[PDB]
């Protein structure tokens, strides 16, 4: 039978709900259980594809081609269950489905109301997502006490009643502020948040308290007294330097044992050896390289969360501390190549639009002509090819049909325009003589795509003759996926997204090689 | 171990909470359990002795001398557990106790707050009241969602947590209104009341729905869905003609079985034979007499609730329907003796003050001179003696020192003034030649007193010579308790309160004889 | 006509409500208005005399002898209106008054309820406190959303309706937390607190936001949007180093102009010259002395708030930075005189009990024998006299009858025991040849007392012969109030409390002289 844990937040948002849910799922997975996580967003957007990177952050791509939130990236980094479209949906999706059915006439002339019909749709989606697992962690976005999240809370309360309270738990996150005047930690906001959740109709079973420091025992006893929660179920989660210590903290406080007691599960003791290994590797670097990431969404760092974490994972595998410096593309466009000095390696991540693309072309030129290690992802691969064709093959302002519709040299164009967006995991074939073959150590690889424009095969032969090699191709139309500069210490560009598959316990060959190249370059340049 | 049921009300007051609690206790007592009931009043009055009859109703006197509410009269009528001071207390009592302790210094210089100290006092009183019983029914006055009753609800929530939820139940009463426009019963007020109770921090276990008619099954299913309560625990209690059918209704709906399942009690099936006997006796009268009750608090009928019910009980024992007509004393004072015509018997209950006493004297005169059966209780006994002394013994305006401090003939006076209030049960000795001896059929009786002024023994010998007999006396000072007119079909006056001991299953000899005399008088006067 | 401002707090307590109310009253007083402040405490204690210093802090003594809270000390430091018993009362006081009246029978047999009677008592007290002033600031203790403060809020809502909304304002204090994760300030707790206050029935007119930093304009616009408050009435009050800058900040944000617009008051522009003078004096010290305060309540610094502020005020008058070091008396008792080294002056404040008194005697001995400046207040004066009598006059363990009832040498005793607590302001006569005469520069002074035991006049002549001089006496019994050591640079002890009369704009002669003596001692000892 399937057990459900519902995770909600109070007082303020931005408490770190996804990280805590991922850590708890990691602990449960370490005990041999089959767990999954699903995210509920109170957004009217049907999917985050329309959303821009400088509002919520990077868009995560699943194996099957769904576009989701950064939370699913967190979950895939923490557990070994592959996410899909069933692990994330919004309010807009539910309303669209119900409106479609009502227009089609599926409700047989009945009045379509919120409490029966909207909450029925929500419950159906939650059950279909959780089917086939031992434990399901359902995280509810928004703060408890807001108009936007009331249908979700009502649905989960009804679901808890229908399923049974011996298979459902409720977990509430709160903020315990610290006041420097009295020098104490205040428990009143938690009390009022529990009161609001009770007014909705849900009794918390576990209270997770978020604070700068650890919550004292007397404060936890007070919380237990005022919130109908047992004293053992008031769990403290202080701020940490590394998110990889959070499973250890929650395990030491006994959250896993309490959850297993309530759900009547007889699972062996948790083995957190891999997480301890990750902590040990992180705590003991032997070097320090600086990587320059040049992109257009520098203002909001969450636009590159997966890429930053993948660089960190590669550093962990190479036992090297990685220092990411963010460089704005328009700065390179106007100020020049001065900013790019003092960098052991350069990374150009993906993006949409023409703003800052010229700066990216300048950056690729500088890296290629200065033998600085370079990694290009999606848009970076395109700008690298454009720079190589223009300034090494003399294509006289070759560009992409994305930016200039008519430039007489469409090196990058839609597959139709060789003179719909590719989504999901695709298979790619690696050439035996290239760097990526020795990096992956496999004949073929599988990676995820979120692009529209491709590399023009008609103009590809000339650029190949100029010296640029192709390291990977698709399955049917032999679309170019990986390119490489031969006369370079390390110069790899890829059409797909490798950051959506790196994990702190396994890493990724591409980023490990990139960081190793950066370390070797700094040792050479010292 | 002791189990606790906490009974609260919502939407509106005056739902009949005490009757429902008494009926449930009756059902539990019919299964062989040791139950008790306690009442919590949100009043600032320390005790109802200061309160006037035309605000809340008659004052109930326990065996030990406590003054309480009408609810304790209900409870003593429904169960066979004697009440005391431990079964009723107010907010004012708790605050007085805590203020006394704080002034005395018992709190050792700590700050006396509401949540720790007031609720600790409340919990201590509740535990001391409930000690030594199988089940304790704690009824909380006021509506849920009011300022006045928040300390009580907080205290009972904390008590439920401390004691354990396998020994505590919460029962909520609500109003299900009926709207004649749509012709339906509305469940929304119940939903909002349950939400308010949850906001306080209590989850109901049982919902009792009050309505003119029975609540339909679909409405109950809706209530169960919206209130986290199982569908079997939504109990309908419609308006009834007789409060004696309520235990049968609650038993038929399965409330007792659910309560016994939750508390893990193995008690035999309920035997409600006596209540069925009472219903059968009530439903089948053979006669119809009319009794005139003359008093000063006629405006509020709750000022004579116990006396009215005792007359009804006597009628049930005599298989006679009793029709109580209320006559205002000042009406007799001004309009005259015209109102008292067409009455088979006359009752004068107790009271305080001089307003209307002359009308009572007129009424006693009329009854004595017309051979109409007469019953006098406390003040009625005094006015009967005054009338007999004045208009048969020629005492020339003899009165009580209560009304006129100096009248030269103090037939009624304080024990000091023979030329502090007696409270509780006292023993009395019956004379062998009198009516009350054959009525009680016992050498001695025990009854309850709530009076200050007594009968003057110095002037008693003359009135005894005039013809009036004394039927009962006290133990030490031979205070007169019962008097009788010999040349009358039925003329009994008592100093105590016999209505505080009549029950529908046992009755009372005095009221049974009074009603029988009324029936005989009507048969004679045909 | 009298205008009322009601000040409440939300989210958490300890926001600094009294300081903000005092600053606003200071601004209004700077515009020529007649203002007063009153404090409402949700305590069951009738008065803080029973409370101990290590729970809430020092007890404030008014001119008329009332014992109050530290808030009244704040108010007297900020405005020039003398407080009294009418400026502070608790829940326990209101309940005691109502219980007394109900027992006495003043309510004529009616039921005494919370909403009519308790709130009527509260309103009567508030009106009697505010009568005769232009503006009244009523501060309500407790957080909005607690059981303990609901009667106060209901009373003030009813009062606002009765008086009129053109003479009543509501001011709400909230916490705007800062989250280091996102690096933003969160407005959600303020939104929920305003919702709770609205649920009680009060619409805020002004929102005062408390935070580490200043609240940004966009956040304030959001607060205005969500809370029905105009954008100009959302006032930011960040944490400050000096509480004397708070009136300037509130004045710069336009709170005074808004309040005067709402109340239709035409008062001249605020003149905050004196507060600017205080800030200038504080910001520019020329020296740095360290003062050792030795006492028994060192654990809670609020037990000496007035004394600490008075030392700071004296330093401001002497343009000297004052560094207060707290020394525990039992430390001196056990560890010895080692702790008292490196101190330019020593202060012994008052207290009750024998614990630590021996350490105080040791400290007085050390100061007297080392010519370190010494100030003694109440208990300190007693221990100084005990030390002088024992170790200079050889009284062989002379003590107070407070500690040892029978010691054969009662230098300190009750006025009866020469072989009830003095409260309020009393007049004292200064001797012309003493230090205090040149300090006060007046024949007589008026100060406040909170003591029981006095100096024995019978044994006083011997100690006077030994060398100790008496500098002040009472009016009728010539009770000793001030003593002095002649062969000392500065050694003054007083029976009264001079810290209850020092203000940052006027200071106090005694503490100014004490701090000047400390500076001279350090210059000598350098
Ligand atoms: N549900 C509650 C809980 C507390 N109190 C009252 O609130 C006061 C406590 O002050 P406060 O410090 O604000 O409460 P804490 O529980 O200590 O909250 P915090 O942890 O933030 O300090 C006490 O007098 C108590 O009677 C109340 O009225 N209602
Ligand atoms: N907690 C709830 C429950 C009901 N609904 C909505 O309220 C409407 C139902 O109307 P109403 O008759 O007032 O609700 P009932 O449950 O039928 O209440 P009642 O028994 O009084 O008729 C439905 O559209 C439903 O979506 C809601 O918004 N919130
Ligand atoms: N009364 C309100 C106000 C806000 N929202 C929703 O809450 C979300 C905003 O998230 P949050 O940051 O928590 O709200 P803020 O107003 O920005 O609160 P804060 O200042 O603490 O960040 C929005 O989607 C909005 O639709 C809501 O449902 N009910
Ligand atoms: C994948 C990405 O960053 C988009 C690049 C470009 N706009 C495209 O191919 O769609
Ligand atoms: C018992 C009663 O009705 C009071 C009667 C008279 N006032 C008395 O004796 O106190
Ligand atoms: C005023 C003070 O500190 C008390 C000192 C001593 N106990 C007394 O006189 O009461
Ligand atoms: N304990 C924690 N410390 C830091 N960031 C967090 N995000 C979620 N939980 C966290
Ligand atoms: N069901 C009911 N009918 C009439 N009066 C009542 N008082 C309490 N319950 C009642
Ligand atoms: N703004 C403020 N800074 C510091 N302490 C305070 N107490 C009250 N208001 C304050
Ligand atoms: Mg506290
Ligand atoms: Mg309906
Ligand atoms: Mg926000």
Author numbering:
A (entry chain B), B (entry chain C), C (entry chain A): 2 to 420, 438 to 544
The article reads:
Cytidine triphosphate synthase (CTPS) plays a critical role in catalyzing the final and rate‐limiting step of de novo cytidine triphosphate (CTP) synthesis. CTPS is composed of a glutamine amidotransferase (GAT) domain and a kinase‐like ammonia ligase (AL) domain 1 , 2 . It utilizes ammonia generated from glutamine and adenine triphosphate (ATP) as an energy source to convert the substrate uridine triphosphate (UTP) into CTP 3 . Filaments of CTPS have been confirmed and characterized in multiple species and conditions, where ecCTPS has been shown to form large‐scale inhibitory filaments in the presence of product CTP 20 .
